[PDB]
Amino acid sequence: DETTALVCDNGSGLVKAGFAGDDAPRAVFPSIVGRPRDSYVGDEAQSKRGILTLKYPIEHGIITNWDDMEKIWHHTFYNELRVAPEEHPTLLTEAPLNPKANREKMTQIMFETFNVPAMYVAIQAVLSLYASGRTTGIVLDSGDGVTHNVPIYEGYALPHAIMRLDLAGRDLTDYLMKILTERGYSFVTTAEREIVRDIKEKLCYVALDFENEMATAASSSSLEKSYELPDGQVITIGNERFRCPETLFQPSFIGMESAGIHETTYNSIMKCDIDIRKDLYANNVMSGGTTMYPGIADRMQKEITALAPSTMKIKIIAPPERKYSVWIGGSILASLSTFQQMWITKQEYDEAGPSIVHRK
């Protein structure tokens, strides 16, 4: 009783990797490669920031630099997981609407440079749904660099209904920097960037009623928190706690003229057949780190309720572990006996070259 499949969730900001069967990813590091400002990957690249030039091979959920991507995979295999890829079937994740050639290239690299016995490429958003013990529903996946709405029916993600929003964690962090600086503070350097990133993950939240909440803050406290900087100097965060996440719903807070997450979720469903929409509205799962704000479920519930027919059952699935739902769904799926017949073997690969990854 041994072998152990690997699950690698390649994210635009964070790569999540561990073993199938585990309840959580073994390693979680930033998707960055450091070149001589001789190369570093992940946390170390972050540290040696100054003497390095940082590249992000996965800007918007899609891999765009294959040399750097190999750097990352090599790193996660040997440094992070400290395993020998040659003896581990590997399950990979990809963004919705990932180009065929791109998927085939991931397969090529997997078999030809890391000689994995087998592997599979799965749609990130579908795994999120699976992580819930469901095969039908609409997923709002929102990470560091991109946000998607994916309607899925019995495992089938309807392509023409996919909604992609170029606004995610990275943008909220950047915005919370602008409004924090405007409130009479200074946040502009890269270290200040990570500080703000921390403030956002610990003290930000989504307001059920923006305006009401906005007045409550402008009137008194209770909506004010204190955060200790590395200086030891402590500051107070006011209405920026909810002004920050509020942009998910109002992309204009950053001058972006596009629908908010409640609207992309609404439109995705509307691109689907009338008879299944009910199943989308009643199984709306949220995954990704930018989906972690407290109150975001109740807010979405509210917004979709104002968009949908007054007779629709609206339900949001927002698990506490949703920051890793994709990875987790990958872990469960790869651990299924019924899934074992789904792997792409080195043989089937040798006898078919890439493109063999097309069977979804």
Partner: protein, 436 residues
């Protein structure tokens, strides 16, 4: 065949003995729920308990043969009494299912509290909503669904159990809801229109294909529906439907990228849901197709001629199938009248040009009703609609204008898609077409 004279009684009695009382009851609940889609869970259960009452008693060796036909006619007797405990009736297809599977937690909550109560509510609500699918499939799916809920809600790992079970149920679940959907469409149209509709949809999905490429497929699926939808065979649909996707892929696998992607899916039902949901493609811009000539219309064995017209037209007209189907059917039947009455070249001179404009008009109006729906997100579609409507009714108040956006938006969300519901949109396209 069924010449039994007692066939019914010996049929049910046989079932009662083979399945046992519990299962016969479950079979009856599913059976009667698909028969009475608008029947209440209370009305249906009463009818079922009654039916199983007389069945157990009158199927017993010793029971006087006299009974079954007795309590059966007595059973139908109570059906006439006012406020009868049984389901009312003026069997129509359900184009808007309201069944919504609860969350895994709600399912298990309700299942721990009362299993039987849960099982019956699930079989009734599911059957009444997807009753158009073959009985053998409903009974099968239903039983397999409850089995899953029974083992996953007591599992150490409820979540992984559910994924595993749901993935294994996938095939039958699709086979069941898909067959219910397409059978509902077939029932609403009838063999004749259904075939026309399937050709139109196929045309809109693969505009660049040959008639001989898609016509066979449109005929096959129609044949399968005609034969399988209301069939007693436990394997008509189960066997026919997946066999149909193989042909479908054999013909269309390489015709365009969407069908190629769909044909790369792992299983037969994975491919069918894919092609079923596939939207109307970006149709080519082409010169109007002229109505069929008088010789074509009257000539014997002219089906091929009429099929090519439907195909050629459908692949170049940007209009939903529900629209095209309700116009092409009458248009042709009308042109058909000219062949009967003496003197062909005469009536075809009066009715001919009349039908052209009437069809041309109908299309332009339809294309107006479905404004920008296909081209954008619903949200953006509503913005544009509000704008073109503010330019067409300047003297309209913000409220009247707002009321109009909704009604037209609502209408479009229902009738401007390739799989818009037949019955509903037919009467709706009329009530909306006269508003020009």
């Amino acid at each position: 065949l069924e010449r039994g004279r007692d066939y019914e009684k010996n049929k049910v009695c046989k079932e009662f003995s083979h399945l046992g009382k519990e299962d016969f009851t479950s079979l009856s609940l599913v059976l009667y729920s698909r028969k009475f889609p608008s029947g209440t869970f209370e009305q249906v259960s009463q009818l079922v308990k009654e039916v199983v009452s007389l069945t157990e008693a009158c199927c017993a060796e010793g029971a006087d043969p006299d009974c079954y036909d007795t309590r059966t006619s007595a059973l139908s007797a109570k059906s006439c009494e006012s406020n009868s405990p049984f389901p009312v009736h003026p069997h129509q297809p359900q184009e808007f299912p309201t069944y919504v599977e609860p969350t895994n937690d709600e399912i298990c909550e309700a299942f721990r509290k009362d299993p039987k109560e849960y099982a019956n509510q699930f079989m009734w609500e599911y059957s009444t909503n997807y009753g158009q699918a073959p009985l053998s499939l409903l009974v099968s799916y239903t039983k397999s669904y409850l089995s899953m809920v029974g083992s996953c809600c007591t599992s150490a790992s409820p979540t992984v159990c559910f994924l595993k079970e749901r993935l294994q149920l996938k095939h039958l679940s699709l086979l069941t809801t898909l067959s219910n959907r397409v059978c509902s469409q077939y029932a609403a149209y009838g063999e004749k229109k259904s075939r026309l509709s399937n050709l139109i949809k196929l045309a809109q999905k693969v505009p660049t294909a040959d008639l001989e490429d898609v016509l066979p497929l449109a005929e096959d699926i129609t044949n399968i529906l005609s034969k399988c939808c209301e069939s007693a065979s436990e394997d008509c649909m189960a066997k026919e439907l997946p066999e149909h996707t193989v042909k479908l892929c054999d013909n269309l696998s390489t015709k365009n990228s969407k069908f190629e992607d769909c044909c790369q899916e792992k299983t037969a039902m994975d491919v069918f849901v894919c092609t079923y949901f596939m939207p109307a493609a970006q149709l080519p811009e082409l010169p109007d197709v002229e109505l069929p000539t008088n010789k074509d219309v009257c000539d014997p064995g002219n089906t091929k001629v009429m099929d090519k017209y439907t195909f050629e037209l459908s692949r170049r007209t940007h209009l939903p199938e529900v629209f095209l189907s309700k116009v092409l059917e009458p248009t042709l039947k009308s042109l058909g009248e000219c062949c009967d009455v003496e003197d062909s070249t005469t009536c075809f001179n009066a009715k001919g040009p009349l039908l052209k404009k009437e069809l041309s008009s109908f299309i332009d109006k339809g294309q107006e009703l479905c404004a920008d729906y296909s081209e954008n997100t619903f949200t953006e579609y509503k913005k544009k609609l509000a704008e073109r409507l503010k330019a067409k009714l300047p003297d309209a108040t913000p409220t009247e204008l707002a009321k109009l956006v909704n009604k037209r938006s609502d209408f479009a969300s229902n009738c401007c898609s390739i799989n818009s519901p037949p019955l509903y949109c037919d009467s709706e396209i009329d009530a909306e077409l006269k508003n020009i």
